[PDB]
Amino acid sequence: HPETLVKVKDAEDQLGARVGYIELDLNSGKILESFRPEERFPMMSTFKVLLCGAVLSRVDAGQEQLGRRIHYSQNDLVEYSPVTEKHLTDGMTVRELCSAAITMSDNTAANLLLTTIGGPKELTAFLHNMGDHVTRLDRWEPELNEAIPNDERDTTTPAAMATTLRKLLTGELLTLASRQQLIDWMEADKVAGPLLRSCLPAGWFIADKSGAGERGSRGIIAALGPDGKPSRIVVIYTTGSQATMDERNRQIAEICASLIKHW
Numbered sequence: 001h002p003e004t005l006v007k008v009k010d011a012e013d014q015l016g017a018r019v020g021y022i023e024l025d026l027n028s029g030k031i032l033e034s035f036r037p038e039e040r041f042p043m044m045s046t047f048k049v050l051l052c053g054a055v056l057s058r059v060d061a062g063q064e065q066l067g068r069r070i071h072y073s074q075n076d077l078v079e080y081s082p083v084t085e086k087h088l089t090d091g092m093t094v095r096e097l098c099s100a101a102i103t104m105s106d107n108t109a110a111n112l113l114l115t116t117i118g119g120p121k122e123l124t125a126f127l128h129n130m131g132d133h134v135t136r137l138d139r140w141e142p143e144l145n146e147a148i149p150n151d152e153r154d155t156t157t158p159a160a161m162a163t164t165l166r167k168l169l170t171g172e173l174l175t176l177a178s179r180q181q182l183i184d185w186m187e188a189d190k191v192a193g194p195l196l197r198s199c200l201p202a203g204w205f206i207a208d209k210s211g212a213g214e215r216g217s218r219g220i221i222a223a224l225g226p227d228g229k230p231s232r233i234v235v236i237y238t239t240g241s242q243a244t245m246d247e248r249n250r251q252i253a254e255i256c257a258s259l260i261k262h263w
Contacts, residue, residue, distance in 0.1 A: 001033065001262035004255060008035050011251035017216055017241035020158035021255070024233040026170055026223060029163075032232070037159035041237035042147040044211030045105045046161070046221050047123075047137055047154070049186060052098040053168040054117050054126040056178040059094075066095035070112060079142045081108035102185035102209060107141035114140065127164065130173055134160035145213030147239055161221060162235040169207075169223055169233075183207045183223060183230070194249050196222050196234065199256035205230050216241030218248045226263065234259065 004023075011019050020041045023033035031037075058064035071091035077084065083100035084092065085108070092100070097113050100106035117123060120137040127135050137144065138153040146154075156164075167173055169183050186207035189197075197206055205228045211219030217239045225231030236252060 001258065003262060004033060004258040005035055007251075007255040007258045011238070011255060015216070015238060015241040015243045015248065015251060017238050017243075019251075020235065020237035022158040022162040022233075022235040023259070024162045024166060024235075026166065026225070026230055026232050029166060031159075031162075034159070038157055040152055040155040040157055041219060041239055042145065042211075042213055042217045043135070043137070043154055043156050043161070044145055044147075044213045044217055044219050046156075046209055046211045046219050047144070048101045048105065048110050049182070049209045049221065050127065050135070050137075050164065050168070051110060051113055051117075051123055052102060052185065053174065053182055054123055055094065055098060055113055056174055056182060057126065058117065060175050060178055064094060064116060066093065068094050070094065070097070070116075072108075072112060076112070077108050078111060078140075079107060081106055084108040084112070099185055099188075103188045103190050105191050105210070111141050120144075130164070130167060132160055132164045135164060145217065147213045147215045147217040149215070149240060158235045158237055162233050165221055165223070165235070166233055169230075186223065192220065195220055195252050196224065196256050199253055199260060200224070201226070201260065203228055211237075212245070215239065216243060216248070218245075218252075220252065 008019050008021050021035035083106045097109045100109040123137050135156040144154040192208050192210035206224040208222035219237040222234045223230045
């Protein structure tokens with residue numbers, strides 16, 4: 001809807017930064033709205049959904065098991081590890097690591113998962129072989145959140161991300177069991193409260209994954225819809241601003257308000 005684009009334009013003016021926006025119909029796959037669809041933005045934590053999608057792909061092929069237990073040590077813990085820092089002794093299963101990586105955005109969990117698939121290169125290789133020749137991951141946590149201007153490392157485009165996410169959640173790649181698991185994790189998101197979820201009316205379905213980083217970086221991907229059922233994928237990115245966390249969240253609030261209003 002045009003008014004939603006106005007909210008995005010208002011956001012660019014008041015934040016002093018670029019904003020990426022894609023509105024994608026989950027049923028048909030037709031884009032309903034776009035803003036800077038072919039420009040690159042830092043993925044930040046949003047890649048973690050893609051990461052666990054690759055892991056689940058290995059689960060389907062029998063190359064990985066969700067119940068497989070992994071142990072690690074103190075020297076594996078990086079910044080922000082709210083879940084993994086509490087299981088140094090008992091370790092964690094692969095299923096728990098993806099749960100921690102998506103719902104709590106655990107960084108160490110993300111790194112351990114990247115080890116299971118063979119690093120950022122293999123995640124990129126996975127995305128390449130499923131049709132996404134655009135999205136790329138180059139570094140580990142937390143260096144991937146650097147968000148240096150004009151740096152293409154660890155970046156996606158709003159169009160590439162939205163189409164890729166659709167293939168994971170409602171495509172032919174994963175099994176029905178794996179598709180359901182991935183969107184179950186996203187629905188249990190704990191760290192995206194004051195964003196899209198804050199805008200939604202009662203009874204709405206939402207499965208999302210937020211993002212934040214350096215140099216006014218912020219992002220979010222989501223699969224949502226009214227009547228307790230997902231009907232649309234929304235991708236929002238922004239970078240380069242010097243605005244605080246609160247104002248960046250407020251712009252997403254304003255954009256979301258128009259999105260739901262003109263649903």
